[PDB]
């Protein structure tokens with residue numbers, strides 16, 4: 810009661826600035842920065858015949 | 859600055875107190891009095907009240 814300060818905690822909600830764990834071999838999650846750093850440099854397959 | 863109760867003589871023998879009507883603009887401390895009132899429960903939620 811009184812002056813009540815409500816944030817995402819007392820409602821058990823995710824923060825606006827929140828991040829999930831990176832995906833593992835058996836877990837689903839964010840894609841890691843170095844995963845993309847490996848992906849982009851990986852040249853696309855060459856289409857010949 | 860005294861509060862005087864007005865007395866009026868009834869028909870048989872008595873002298874009863876009677877009240878005069880006043881307008882809401884007449885009482886001199888009414889607005890401060892109603893301003894000083896505070897809500898019992900949550901006054902405001904996250905800086906906002908009423909229909910929240």
Ligand SMILES: [Fe+3]
Nearest residue numbers: 823827828829
């Ligand atoms: Fe999320």
